[PDB]
Design an enzyme around this catalytic site. Structure first.
Site, PDB file in Angstrom:
ATOM      1  CG  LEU A 199     -10.352   1.279   2.116  1.00 25.10           C
ATOM      2  CD1 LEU A 199     -11.710   1.159   1.440  1.00 25.10           C
ATOM      3  CD2 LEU A 199     -10.501   1.114   3.621  1.00 25.10           C
ATOM      4  CB  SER A 200      -5.312  -2.278  -1.178  1.00 27.32           C
ATOM      5  OG  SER A 200      -4.461  -3.350  -1.555  1.00 27.32           O
ATOM      6  N   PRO A 201      -5.425  -4.560   1.458  1.00 32.78           N
ATOM      7  CG  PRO A 201      -6.665  -6.387   2.177  1.00 32.78           C
ATOM      8  CD  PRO A 201      -6.646  -5.321   1.129  1.00 32.78           C
ATOM      9  CG  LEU A 204      -7.440   2.375  -2.057  1.00 33.37           C
ATOM     10  CD1 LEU A 204      -7.703   3.861  -2.324  1.00 33.37           C
ATOM     11  CD2 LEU A 204      -8.471   1.537  -2.785  1.00 33.37           C
TER      12      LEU A 204
END
Ligand code: GSH
Ligand code: GSH
Lengths: 220, 220
Positions: free
Chosen positions: A10-12, A8
């Site tokens: 958005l996931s760092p 995803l």
């Protein structure tokens, strides 16, 4: 067959892997695992990772979990040299220390702030969270004795660290005057031709989403 | 050449992880005490040595390595008669690397989120969210233990990292047997090691007891 990343944007830790793939000239087939709708908790994902976290790599049937393990695996298998992850034991030790600083300090403290807002309906960022994150910034600043987190050369440890810092700085303020080394290091990474696509946009967007969710949660 | 030097405190989980590793490798460690409880880690000379002011720190003949996981990997790499404790096969190593970051990013981080405020910030409670976070970490570990050890059929440094933390936190946030049969069977395996109690077990129990005593002293 292409490398597949369950991911995803958005996931760092997902973005850390994206940066690594760009640096290695690898094309990833990205399969969305939407955490907001609980995709990671479906039986077909849990079978790939009992810890039900993203990212997960599928390399021709071989499943590798965890962003740092994935980055090391990709550099080991596909790197044309070891610049991103050194084979020399002493140079590698400095990189390994920084990778664990990222998981144990930067990311853990970011997650201790974000998870409760994103998934548990919380509308606050408690003082103790803020303190922990500000301390993580101080620790990173003091670690940056060289131009990059693990020495004079950029490594996968920089990708891990920037993926997190670029996300949390939008939420818990990272004061420029107090962190000149961090800002100078961010400027170095922003020079990468693939920085914006692989990381910058998603980091900024995660911070904005956390702020939006906090507001939504305050209202209902 | 010089014996290996560890800046350390037996009460500290990551220090005990390194102690287990040295015992497994048949290495002698010259232990130099850094008493966190009296602020020894903040003295100018130690901060110069490790800007993050954490223990353990290894000094190998002038080579300084911070961070327990990096120290463990270095010791196996340089001094292991074989690489059983830290494999070189990329896929087996990825499994160990994933477990090491689970330990730093989940097990240890959540233990520290519980303990630090009591040990150092004068707090006298364990908030419900901390308990839940730690219980979740136990569940994640239980689900990871599909094999005899955390990262496969062979004991690795990932087991030493995990047990050093588990043995500490389980005295404060109970790790209940009926819910964690795999964890308890794994503990039993580690307890068969002749050096387990000395290098780790007693220290973990002592830290849990000290946290509870400090919690009560901090009250009102
Ligand atoms: N150390 C892991 C951390 C992964 C992680 O916590 N990812 C989050 C998203 S940023 C996740 O999947 N959370 C869902 C969950 O924990 O159930 C890594 O770097 O891969
Ligand atoms: N990831 C590090 C964690 C080190 C750590 O946080 N150690 C604690 C003791 S358990 C410490 O030295 N705390 C003092 C401080 O952070 O100022 C490692 O495994 O070495």
């Amino acid at each position: 067959s292409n490398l597949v990343l369950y991911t995803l944007h958005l996931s760092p830790p997902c973005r850390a892997v994206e940066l690594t793939a760009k640096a290695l000239g690898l094309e990833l087939e990205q399969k969305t695992i939407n955490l907001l709708t609980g995709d990671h908790l479906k039986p077909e994902f849990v079978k790939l990772n009992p810890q039900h976290t993203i990212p997960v790599l599928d390399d021709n049937g071989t499943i590798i979990t965890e962003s740092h393990a994935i980055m090391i695996y990709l550099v080991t298998k596909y790197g044309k040299d070891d610049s991103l992850y050194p084979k020399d034991p002493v140079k590698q030790a400095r990189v390994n220390s920084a990778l664990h600083f990222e998981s144990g300090v930067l990311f853990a403290r970011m997650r201790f702030i974000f998870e409760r807002i994103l998934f548990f309906g919380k509308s606050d960022i408690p003082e103790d969270r803020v303190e922990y994150v500000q301390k993580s910034y101080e620790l990173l600043e003091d670690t940056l004795v060289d131009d990059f987190v693990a020495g004079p050369t950029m490594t996968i440890a920089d990708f891990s660290c920037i993926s997190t810092i670029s996300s949390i700085m939008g939420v818990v303020p990272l004061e420029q005057s107090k962190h000149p080394r961090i800002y100078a290091w961010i400027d170095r990474l922003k020079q990468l031709p693939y920085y914006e696509e692989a990381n910058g946009g998603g980091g900024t967007d995660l911070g904005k989403f956390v702020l939006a969710k906090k507001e939504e949660n305050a209202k209902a």
